[PDB]
Amino acid sequence: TSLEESEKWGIDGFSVWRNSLSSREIQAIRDYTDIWHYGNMNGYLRGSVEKLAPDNAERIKNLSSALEKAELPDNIILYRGTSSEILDNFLDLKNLNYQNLVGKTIEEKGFMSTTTISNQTFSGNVTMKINAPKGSKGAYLAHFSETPEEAEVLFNIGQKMLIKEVTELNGKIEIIVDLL
Amino acid sequence: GPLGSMRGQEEIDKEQYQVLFIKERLIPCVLGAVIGDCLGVPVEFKDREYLKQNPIVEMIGYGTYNQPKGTWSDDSSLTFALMESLISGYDINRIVNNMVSFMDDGFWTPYGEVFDIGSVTRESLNRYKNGVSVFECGGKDNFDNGNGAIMRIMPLVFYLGKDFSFGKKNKITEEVTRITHAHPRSILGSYVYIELLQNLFANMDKKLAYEEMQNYIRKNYSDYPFKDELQYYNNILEGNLYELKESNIKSSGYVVDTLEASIWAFLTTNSYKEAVLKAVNLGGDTDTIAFITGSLAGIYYKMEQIPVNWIDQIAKKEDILNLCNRFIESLI
Ligand SMILES: Nc1ncnc2c1ncn2[C@@H]1O[C@H](COP(=O)(O)OP(=O)(O)OC[C@H]2O[C@H](O)[C@H](O)[C@@H]2O)[C@@H](O)[C@H]1O
Ligand SMILES: [Mg+2]
Ligand SMILES: [Mg+2]
């Protein structure tokens, strides 16, 4: 909940993981913090980009190898800002009923970024509150971005999230999900 | 703050998931329509009774127009010409320009030659070439109510995207139709088709999409010049088209016959292949009725129901997919 509590959690649970990463694993994590690399990696995994470039293939391989060695040390609640475009296949776009999303499973084919800190205003019209169970394939990332305060938990590809409840107000949608 | 570098991702995510949403609908809509055109070209103008004895089950060649298997016609060509024009934004003068290039120079033909173009279409484009403005060159006669506008406007639904409001849709659908088909009966037909296709784009089940279109058209197009034209659309707009029998379905190039037939073929079948083969085997304007049906079934059932056997026989398949991807990119 607190940044201090988030940083202690990250150190206690991911110090061994981080000091055991190869140089190419570290570079792939740093590269992912570059929005240009982010778009190329997640674009391909999601299918918005059809062609697989060898260099993108290598970055994805090294990031996935890194996160495959990581596991959440306990159950934690994480946060993610996103867009309603991820829900468009689940809705009647001319008769929007967000309550009918309850029970649907969202899949993220790419890497999934989350933050441990809820006391922030996210960019976009969907906020997700994620109940992440112990043992999930995510890693706390400290000192990997150019933002020293960044409190990030990055999940490996293919996470699935079951929608448990929905709140809507002025086109701003809050979604509570269980990470499967 | 603690979100840090993750804050930037949301705008990229929005763009990427918009690409996927559009691609999932656009590619099977285009391929589904084009395949219907290909299936029907070699039997255009053949009678229904001949087709009952010799039904289309696959792409055949060297019938009407003496073309190879997998050859699409003006329906697909003018659809591609509209996609090309829209990439840099809606501009009615670029739209008509590309249509003239199809007619004159074989722009977006399968082998470089125009083997067919409709008469209303040709007469209207020839008027534009001579100085008649794009708002006055379209045919207005009672017998100018062919289906040549409805066969070339499906890209407008994708251009509108998740703008489901009335105003822009109402304007551009009329403007683009009127280039060739300026009679209010034809314009009303365009609104019917666009509304149904938009409702399927929006993820409605097919019967709801149909029912919502009926209410919408009656609500918005009951004043002059459309009030007097609604009667010709009674089988579509009043009651259940899907209760009609084949013997009640007419499959000429008349815009009313064509919309009745294509929507009926879609509502009374349960797969893409069933829909387009049912449409083609009505005889008459087989390529166009099957193109329209294939646009509706394609967007509804999506790529898993479009036979790969048919996709691979389409002339210039790779160029069509490249145009689809360039169009999708322009909509983001
Ligand atoms: N009021 C009416 N009542 C009955 N039939 C009508 C009426 N108005 C028109 N028709 C019939 O509508 C038909 C119009 O045919 P054409 O003018 O060649 O085409 P297009 O420019 O519309 O569009 C391209 C078409 O031609 C290509 O092959 C495409 O694939 C399409 O089939 C005629 O049979 C008219 O008798
Ligand atoms: Mg044709
Ligand atoms: Mg035809």
Instruction: Give kind and range of the element (H or E) at residue B208.
Output: helix B206-220
Q: Is B12 exposed, middle or buried (0-12, 13-18, 19+ CB in 10 A)?
A: middle
Instruction: Give kind and range of the element (H or E) at residue A115.
Output: strand A112-115
**Angle (deg, nearest 10), helices B317-331 and B74-86:** 30
Could you give the CA distance from residue A14 to residue B322 in angstroms, rounded to a whole number? 45
Q: Name all domains of chain B by residue range, CATH numbers in brackets.
A: 23-331 (1.10.4080.10)
What letter does residue A75 receive in the DSSP assignment? -
Contact A40, A53 (CB under 8 A): yes
Cis peptide before B225 (omega within 30 of 0): yes
Could you give the CA distance from residue B145 to residue B64 in angstroms, rounded to a whole number? 23
Instruction: Give kind and range of the element (H or E) at residue B103.
Output: helix B92-105
- The atom number, within ligand 1, closest to the CA of B252 reads 34
Tokens for B231? 């009667």
Query: Which amino acid is located at A147 in the chain?
Result: T
Method: X-ray
Q: How many CB atoms lie within 10 A of CB B39?
A: 29
Could you give the CA distance from residue B302 to residue B284 in angstroms, rounded to a whole number? 27
Show Cβ contacts of residue A22 under 8 Å, excluding neighbours closer than 6 positions: A62, A65
Kindly report the CA angle at B115 between B113 and B119, in degrees rounded to 5?
125
Q: Is A74 exposed, middle or buried (0-12, 13-18, 19+ CB in 10 A)?
A: exposed
Show Cβ contacts of residue A66 under 8 Å, excluding neighbours closer than 6 positions: A21, A25, A26, A28, A29, A139
Q: How many helices (H) and strands (E) does chain A have?
A: 4, 8
CA of residue B245 relative to chain centroid, distance: 24
What letter does residue A146 receive in the DSSP assignment? S
Kindly report the CA angle at B310 between B309 and B316, in degrees rounded to 5?
115
Q: Cβ contact (<8 Å) for A85 and B10?
A: no
Q: Note whether A33 contacts B: Cβ–Cβ < 8 A.
A: yes
- What is the resolution of the experimental data for this entry, in Å? 1.6
What letter does residue B13 receive in the DSSP assignment? H
Could you give the CA distance from residue A151 to residue A7 in angstroms, rounded to a whole number? 7
Could you give the CA distance from residue B55 to residue B36 in angstroms, rounded to a whole number? 14
Could you give the CA distance from residue A107 to residue A104 in angstroms, rounded to a whole number? 10
What is the distance in angstroms between the Cα of A2 and the nearest Cα belonging to chain B? 11
Show Cβ contacts of residue B167 under 8 Å, excluding neighbours closer than 6 positions: none
Q: Provide the pairing of β-strand A159-169 with A105-108.
A: antiparallel
Three-state SS at B290: helix
What letter does residue B117 receive in the DSSP assignment? -
Could you give the CA distance from residue B235 to residue B144 in angstroms, rounded to a whole number? 21
Name the residue with the closest Cα to ligand 1, atom 16: B118
Contact A67, A139 (CB under 8 A): yes
Out of B3, B12, B23, whose CB is closest to A120? B3
Q: What share of chain B is helix, strand, coil (3-state, %, to 5)?
A: 65, 0, 35
Show Cβ contacts of residue A146 under 8 Å, excluding neighbours closer than 6 positions: A33, B5
Say yes or no: CB of residue B75 within 6 Å of ligand 1: yes
Tokens for A115? 């933050």
Q: Is B161 exposed, middle or buried (0-12, 13-18, 19+ CB in 10 A)?
A: middle
Tokens for B291? 């193109």
What letter does residue B134 receive in the DSSP assignment? T
B163 labelled binding-site residue: no
By C-alpha distance, which of A128, A150, A110 is closest to A10? A150
Contact B182, B148 (CB under 8 A): no
Q: Cβ contact (<8 Å) for A150 and B14?
A: no
CA of residue A150 relative to chain centroid, distance: 14
Total residue length of chain A: 180
Query: Which amino acid is located at A39 in the chain?
Result: G
Tokens for A5? 């509590």
Could you give the CA distance from residue A22 to residue A49 in angstroms, rounded to a whole number? 28
Q: Cβ contact (<8 Å) for A147 and B10?
A: no
By C-alpha distance, which of B189, B163, B183, B164 is closest to B173? B189
Transcribe B220-282 into DSSP letters: HS-STTTTTTGGGGHHHHSS-GGG--GGG---SSBHHHHHHHHHHHHHT-SSHHHHHHHHHTT
Q: Is A92 exposed, middle or buried (0-12, 13-18, 19+ CB in 10 A)?
A: middle
Contact A138, A3 (CB under 8 A): no
Contact B11, A123 (CB under 8 A): yes
Kindly report the CA angle at B142 between B141 and B147, in degrees rounded to 5?
95
Query: Which amino acid is located at A33 in the chain?
Result: T
Contact B14, B36 (CB under 8 A): no
B285 labelled binding-site residue: yes
Contact B62, B41 (CB under 8 A): no
Could you give the CA distance from residue A122 to residue B3 in angstroms, rounded to a whole number? 8
Query: Which amino acid is located at A7 in the chain?
Result: E
Three-state SS at B91: coil
Q: Residue A82's domain spans which residues? A: 3-179
Tokens for B1? 């703050």
Show Cβ contacts of residue A38 under 8 Å, excluding neighbours closer than 6 positions: A32, B8, B9, B12
Could you give the CA distance from residue B192 to residue B232 in angstroms, rounded to a whole number? 12
Total residue length of chain B: 332
Contact A157, A110 (CB under 8 A): yes
Ramachandran angles phi, psi of A130, nearest 5°? -110, 120
Q: Note whether B17 contacts A: Cβ–Cβ < 8 A.
A: yes
Q: Cβ contact (<8 Å) for B203 and A149?
A: no
Three-state SS at B124: helix
Contact B296, B2 (CB under 8 A): no
Out of B2, B5, B20, whose CB is closest to A3? B2
Q: Where are the alpha helices (DSSP H) in A20-76?
A: 23-32, 35-46, 54-68
Tokens for A139? 């890693």
> Hey, of B11, B13, B19, which one would you mutate to test binding to chain A, going by the most A CBs within 10 A of its CB?
B13
Show Cβ contacts of residue B220 under 8 Å, excluding neighbours closer than 6 positions: B166, B170, B191
By C-alpha distance, which of B197, B198, B200, B147 is closest to B177? B147
Could you give the CA distance from residue B26 to residue B40 in angstroms, rounded to a whole number? 21
Ligand 1 site-directed mutation target among B285, B287, B291, most atoms within 8 Å of CB = B285
End-to-end CA distance of chain B: 29
Q: Cβ contact (<8 Å) for A115 and B202?
A: no
Q: How many CB pairs under 8 A join A and B?
A: 107
HSE, side-chain direction, 13 A CA sphere, residue B134: 15
d(CA A71, ligand 2 centre) in Å: 59
- The atom number, within ligand 1, closest to the CA of B291 reads 30
Could you give the CA distance from residue B206 to residue B212 in angstroms, rounded to a whole number? 10
Q: Where are the alpha helices (DSSP H) in chain A?
A: 3-19, 23-32, 35-46, 54-68
Could you give the CA distance from residue B329 to residue B332 in angstroms, rounded to a whole number? 6
Edge to edge, what strands does the sheet with A76-82 contain? A105-108, A159-169, A172-179, A126-132, A76-82, A112-115, A152-155, A138-141
Burial B207-243 (b: 16+ CB within 10 A, else e): eebbebbbebbeeebeeeebeebbebbebbbeeebee
Q: How many domains does chain A have?
A: 1
By C-alpha distance, which of B231, B235, B215, B213 is closest to B296? B213
Ramachandran angles phi, psi of B306, nearest 5°? -95, 110
Tokens for A22? 């190869």
Ligand 1 site-directed mutation target among B78, B116, B140, B145, most atoms within 8 Å of CB = B145
Q: Note whether A61 contacts B: Cβ–Cβ < 8 A.
A: no
Could you give the CA distance from residue B63 to residue B100 in angstroms, rounded to a whole number? 27
Instruction: Give kind and range of the element (H or E) at residue A174.
Output: strand A172-179
By C-alpha distance, which of B18, B104, B24, B14 is closest to B299? B24
Ligand 1 site-directed mutation target among B143, B185, B193, most atoms within 8 Å of CB = B143
Q: How many CB atoms lie within 10 A of CB B13?
A: 26
Query: Which amino acid is located at B302 in the chain?
Result: K
Q: Is B331 exposed, middle or buried (0-12, 13-18, 19+ CB in 10 A)?
A: middle
Could you give the CA distance from residue B144 to residue A82 in angstroms, rounded to a whole number? 50
Which CATH number is A43's domain given?
A: 3.90.176.10
Contact B314, B320 (CB under 8 A): yes
Pick the residue from chain A with its C-alpha nearest to B195.
A94
Transcribe B35-76 into DSSP letters: HHHHHHGGGTT--HHHHHHS---S---SSTT---TT---HHH
Tokens for B150? 């409805």
Transcribe B138-156 into DSSP letters: SB-SGGG-BSTTGGG-THH
